[PDB]
Amino acid sequence: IPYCGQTGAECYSWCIKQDLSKDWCCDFVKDIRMNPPADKCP
Numbered sequence: 699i700p701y702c703g704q705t706g707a708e709c710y711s712w713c714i715k716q717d718l719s720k721d722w723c724c725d726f727v728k729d730i731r732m733n734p735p736a737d738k739c740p
Contacts, residue, residue: 705735
């Protein structure tokens with residue numbers, strides 16, 4: 699588990715700790731050229 703982590707799913711858990719919005723992270727971990735999972739953001 700390096701900086702953000704390995705994949706996007708795992709990182710999707712940190713961005714939320716910011717308490718901004720469910721779409722806030724969906725657009726963040728997805729903008730980091732990562733591979734977000736399909737079971738987190740519809």
